[PDB]
Structures are given as structure tokens and as C-alpha cells.
Write a protein that binds this ligand. Structure first.
Ligand SMILES: [Zn+2]
Lengths: 246, 55, 55, 246, 246
DNA sequence: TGCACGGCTCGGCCCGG
DNA sequence: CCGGGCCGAGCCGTGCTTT
């Protein structure tokens, strides 16, 4: 029966909300190292991998390894009730329930019965990523919004010390370009010329909820899936794997 | 839900009342799987697709 | 495709407990109780009774 | 004929809005001591009591007593137009018309009709309340909003140095516990153990629009209607009587 | 081929959105002095005129004169995509495409295809206006909002050192009065008693978008149209003409 | 038997106070 | 930052020359 404590319950609520915007069910691994989760959206186009090392937890008491399956909607709604100052506690006794306790001016405890979510193993090997760029969340958020405004798909084109992202509509046109000398980008390293396209629905779903002062690392190449990832408390990490079009 | 292990279905449409003389119901597992896969049912319990015909 | 006048996914009666869209899941969530004309089956051995074909 | 003056039009607007969420039409009695109202919910579940001593109002001039019958929706919409710093004046003359003057950067006047409403006198004297507790508004508001998720009935439990609110559903469950050491519970005086249940919709309607930093006194007994009251501007008070369920 | 630079794209977006509420398509006349627009709504009840001399623009560069036409919805959306502190840039080449770019934290450029609209030049000669009243935007906004509560028409009544806007319904009545000594009125110049009425729909549509602290001057006569004025950064101006009622 | 109008309800956005 | 207002969606309705 493990016990976990996390300061800043609202951060965890936002993280789980972002992770649950694509998958309707999820199985979380509990281990000596930390929490872990992986799944695929029903359409089988985006892969979500989540890692929470034990270091980022105020307390972490685990005496084994197991998996807990919870319905994402119920957990999300329960976690939305935590204020920015609350401390979140997760525990599980020998009984088949999960207890979510929020602490502060008063103690409030919820009980969610575990479900039997089946396990499907999937992992992708390291891919040869010609181009790699790290940017801030706000610029990508606005760019995706504009592309959705005009067109239905986006194109990621990057060259030596230059990153641009276009969205050609039926008649209109959108062009956003940036350079390392600009504040939007932090660095670029392009092995060779690269370009690809991706859907706008999934991009809007995953990029939503990004903070202004957050660094996002994007890796992509020629007509192969793009990988986006950003860190949680300098040790956690959330990764997406968006497939290409055509 | 426990039987078919399908938990993420948000909506599951039914009927106000059965028009047959037996008023037997259909298993809910079939409805859950249909909702999961995004297909609809017909009066006799089949899924159909309509199109114009040419020779 | 082919859909009923209000789209349906399972041939199960719900009445007005689901709303205008006859959502079975929503009615289930709110712990409602629905009264409708349905057929029940009885298990010969133990005595379970309900709208099911297997006990 | 009377002239009544009040500052902070939004406070009066919130009072009227709370009063008007249960009674479609009500009659206010005006007298030298002040203003009072007493109505009852159409379903015969919730009773509303009002009392506004003449010390609350900045100016209070009136001779004799007159009954005022006004539709609550129109009055609510009219008073909803007052900003926070507006000075609200209620006036009447020989004509059976009620005037509502709002004074600010610009003076604005409204005229409303009067409709006669049958008045029924129903006063409930002191009833045996085994347990009496006084808590902040925020604690009860959050408890109700949390219990709203699992089900539509909330259970109140009172014990020696212990106050508990819990809810149960088909599969989920919530529970909030308070104790004298906590800051939510100011004081508890229970002669013997008691328990009851109440409807969530009524509790939310009664507790909605309640100051976060306030003092609410709750009195209830074994399967008997609860009594909730709080002071307004240090003089006026409200009282609610909610029938138990089952 | 022109290069127009405007600081504070939010104000430009607000101005264009206010202009576009009544009409659907308009042609912008650009010359060596500034930009001017004029149109009439499909119901032939409101005429809107707008001008923007070169003094307000941070940088202006035009050779000759041309009229540029474009759909109001798409332009409104593109402007709404702007921010509070960005600088708007309107530029065009030989190709008949309107290129809009916003240069803030990052540079984004949209393409908006052009459209040709028939031009019906009409000028209504200045009429004998028997009243000129200058009031703040907040007072008129709130007065319209109250008047819309009881009836769908509003009435003005000018008098020597006296202004008052009324509204009457089947039973309820609303009245707002102010004088020179008040802080809501700056100057009043009436030649003779005046009375007129205007629809609340059009007044609400055109008033929405005026800052709380602003200068608005209204010219109206006896049973004749009304004119509303207010300056845009002290150089440009906006003209509204509304036909009377009855 | 396809079209055109008009009463609800019912969530997801937004924007300002 | 919490709450109203406004705006689609989605159900139930009508109605489609006539001395
Ligand atoms: Zn059996």
C-alpha cells in the first residue's frame, strides 16, 4: 500500500488534464522509481508517454510495483477541485479503491474504485531526427491557432538558423517565421533540409494548456512523426509522437 | 462495462420504447461496442449503407 | 449511411429518464430509476430475474 | 409613504437574489422598526425569513405600517443594475407605485407596479436542536460543491468535537471532516449524537452567493429540518428551514 | 504599393469591429492625407463615416490614391488575432492581395483576398440641429442598458440647462436626468425644446465599444435624425446617423 | 418527400469587473 | 480569477395556389 504526496495540487490537475485530452482510459505504473503511463488515442495517431521520477514528490513511500486503472473523466473532475496552495495525497490500502486527499484549511477525501483496464505494450525506438528546435509555448500556441483559423493542416519547415511554419488554406495564407536571433527560439541545429505536415486537430489538442514561460523541444524530419516534449519540475517529462500526413 | 471492458464511452443512445410485440431488449455490450467504434443500428439490428446504383 | 430519426446505437428502452436524446449513460450516471415496458427472464436454478438471457 | 436609504446597492441586490431563487412573488412588510419578509417555497420544503432593523439603513423615515407586494423577478433585474458603490433609495407616495432610485455619477429612477399577494402567517417556535455548530461559509460551500459530484443527497453527522459531511453514490464517495483544532469549525455544542440527510439542489441554492469570510450557524437534529442563519451588516439576519429527505 | 504602420493593433481592431457591426462590405479610400470610409446598412437606417488622417499614423507612405475593398468578417477576425502592444502593418504590392502583418514578440503575416464593391456616393447635407449635448460614454452606455430593460424604444428631451433620456413600457417606466452642474454632462446648447425617439436595437449596436472615460457629442432636432461623434486619438472622427421613430 | 421558419435545452468559450 | 452572455448543436413542432 503506497503513499504519495505532491505540493501544488493545481499543477498535477493541469498535467493530468493535458494528458487525458486524447486518451479515455489509462493505466499508471507504480514502481520504486516513480509513476509511469503510456497509451494510444483511439484513432491510433498520437502516442503519450508520461514519466514522474520519485524525486519530484514531497513524499514517496512504495513497497513494491503494481498498476492502477482509473477512469480519466472521474479522476480529472476530482483533481479539478484542488486550489493552487493545496497539497495532494494519493494512497491505496489493501482495498480495491484509490483515495485522493486534498489538504489545506480542511481535509477532503474522495474514493474512486479501480477498474480493469487492459494493458497493451507499445514503444518506439530512437529515430534519426535531422532537425531539432526548442521554443516557447506561447508562440506555438498562437501559430496553431492561426493555422486553424485559416487552414486545416500545418507544415513545419526548418532551415539553417531559421524556423518557419505555414498554413495554406483554400484561398488564404499564413506565414510565421523565426530565427535564433529572435526571442521565440532558443537554438536550432539542422542536419539537412527538412519539411513535413501534420493535422491541426491533434496539434491544437496537445499544445493547448501550454504555459507562456515553458520551453518545448520539437524534433522532426522528412515525412516522419514529430516528437514534442517538455519537462515537469526539472525531472518529470511528457512526450507526444504525432504521425505525419499522406 | 465490466463484461466487455469498455469504459471510455461518453454517450450511448437508446429508444424511448420498443415497437415489437415481444419487447425483448438487445444486450448492452453490443451497444457499447457500437458506440466505441462509431456505428449505428437499424430496426432489425443491422448496420446499413445507402447509395445510388449504376450499371 | 442510414440512421433512425433520432440516431440510435442500442435497441434498449429508456423512456424519458435519458432526456430528449435518450442517453442511457447519462441516466445511469445520475442514479435515476426508469419505468418502461420490457421483457424479463428468470433463471430456473437460483431465481435471478431481469432483462437478460444469461444469469 | 416612506423614504428608505441604503448604501452598497450590490449587497441589497444579492440579498434580493438569494430571496428570489425560491419564491416567485413575496410581500414585504414595512414598519417603524424596519422591514421583514416571510415566504415559503412552492413545494413546501424551504422557508425564508427576513429581518432588516431600521439601524441598518442610513435613513429610515416612515409613519404607520404598509404592505408591499411586488413581483420578485422584475425587482431582481432592476436591482441587478446597481454597481458596488451606488446608493440605493426606496420611496413611495400616495400612488400605489414603488420607486427604486439608484444614485451615482448619474441619477436613475425606476417605477414598478404593485400586485396584491395573499399573506399567510407561519411562525415556528424553538425546536429541539441536539447539535448546534457555527462554521465559515467557505467550508460548507466547498463541501456542498464536492458532494454534488457523487450524488444528490448529503448527510450531516455531528459528534463531540467532530463535524462530518459525507455523500455516497453508486460507486464513488466523498467525506469532509472538521474538528475544533481546524479553523473551519468555530465552535460545536452537541448534547447527543445526531444524523440527517438533505437534498443537494436545495443546499446549493441556499449556500450559493454566501460570503467566503462569514459566520454561519447550523442547527439540526435526528431526522428533522435544519436551521441555517447568518448576520447581514451586523444587524439583519436570514433563516432557512429545509425539510429532511425520507 | 504603400507602407502603413499603426501602434496598438487592439485599438484598430476595436474601431473596425465597431464599424462592421451595422454593415457587411465597405471600400476604404486611401490618399496622401489619410484613410476614409463611408457606407449605409442594408436596411437604409444608419450611415457610418470614418476618417483617419496621416497625423495619427506613426509612418505613412502612399503614392496617388486607391480604394481597397474586402469582407468585414475576415478582416475583423485577423485584427482580433492581434495583441494589445503590437504594431499593425498594412502593406500591399502590385498583386491585388492585402497583406496584414503584426510585429510584436514574433512576426506573423496573413493574406486576405480583395473584393470589388459598387460605390454609391451619398452626402446628407448638414441639417438645422436644435440641440448639441456632450456627455461621457459611460452615462449613455448605462442609460441604454437600463432603457432596454423596459421597452424597445428610447426618448430624448432637451431643455435649457436640462437633458433627460426616458423609456416607457406597458407598465414599467425608466428615466435618467442630468444637468450642467452634474459631472456627467459637460456642455449643453439648446435653441428650443426638443423631443425624439430612436430604436434601442441600433443604439445598443452602435454604442457598444465606447470607453468609460470618453467624449461623445449628440446632435438632434425635433423629429429628425440624430448624429453621434467622438474622436479617435484626437485627429480622426467617427460619424453615426440614425433615423428617428414614429 | 426535401426544404424553410419558429419554441426550447445545453455546454464551450470567452470577456470584463 | 469566477461568473454571466452569447452562440452553435440537437430534440420536439408547423406549413407548402383552390371560385
Ligand atoms: Zn442463475
Amino acid at each position: 500500500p503506497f503513499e504519495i504526496v505532491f505540493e501544488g495540487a493545481k499543477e498535477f490537475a493541469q498535467l493530468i488534464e493535458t494528458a487525458s485530452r486524447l486518451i479515455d482510459e489509462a493505466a499508471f505504473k507504480v514502481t520504486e522509481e516513480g509513476i509511469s503511463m503510456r497509451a494510444m488515442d483511439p484513432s491510433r495517431v498520437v502516442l503519450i508517454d508520461l514519466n514522474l521520477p520519485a524525486s519530484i514528490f514531497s513524499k514517496y513511500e512504495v513497497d513494491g510495483e503494481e498498476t492502477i486503472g482509473v477512469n480519466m473523466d472521474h479522476l480529472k473532475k476530482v483533481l479539478k477541485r484542488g486550489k493552487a496552495k493545496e497539497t495532494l495525497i494519493l494512497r491505496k490500502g489493501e482495498e480495491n479503491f484509490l483515495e485522493i486527499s486534498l489538504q489545506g484549511t480542511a481535509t477532503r477525501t474522495f474514493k474512486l474504485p479501480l477498474i480493469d483496464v487492459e494493458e497493451i505494450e507499445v514503444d518506439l525506438p530512437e529515430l534519426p531526427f535531422t532537425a531539432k528546435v526548442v521554443i516557447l509555448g506561447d508562440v506555438i500556441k498562437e501559430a496553431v491557432k492561426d493555422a486553424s483559423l485559416v487552414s486545416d493542416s500545418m507544415k513545419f519547415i526548418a532551415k539553417e538558423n531559421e524556423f518557419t511554419m505555414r498554413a495554406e488554406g483554400e484561398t488564404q495564407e499564413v506565414e510565421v517565421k523565426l530565427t535564433l536571433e529572435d526571442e521565440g527560439l532558443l537554438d536550432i541545429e539542422v542536419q539537412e533540409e527538412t519539411k513535413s505536415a501534420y493535422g491541426i486537430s491533434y496539434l491544437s489538442d496537445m499544445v493547448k494548456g501550454l504555459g507562456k514561460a515553458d520551453e518545448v523541444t520539437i524534433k522532426f524530419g522528412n515525412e516522419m512523426p514529430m516528437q514534442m516534449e517538455y519537462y515537469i519540475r526539472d525531472e518529470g517529462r511528457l512526450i507526444f509522437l504525432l504521425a505525419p500526413r499522406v | 462495462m465490466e463484461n466487455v471492458k469498455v469504459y471510455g464511452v461518453d454517450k450511448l443512445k437508446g429508444v424511448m420504447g420498443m415497437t415489437s410485440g415481444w419487447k425483448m431488449p438487445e444486450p448492452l455490450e453490443k451497444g457499447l461496442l457500437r458506440a466505441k467504434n462509431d456505428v449505428y443500428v437499424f430496426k432489425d439490428g443491422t448496420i446499413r449503407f445507402d447509395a445510388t446504383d449504376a450499371p | 449511411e442510414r440512421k433512425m430519426k433520432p440516431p440510435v446505437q442500442v435497441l434498449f428502452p429508456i423512456g424519458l429518464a435519458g432526456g430528449s436524446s435518450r442517453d442511457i449513460k447519462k441516466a445511469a450516471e445520475e442514479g435515476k430509476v426508469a419505468e418502461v415496458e420490457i421483457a424479463f427472464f428468470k433463471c430456473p436454478k437460483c431465481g435471478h430475474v431481469g432483462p437478460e438471457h444469461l444469469c
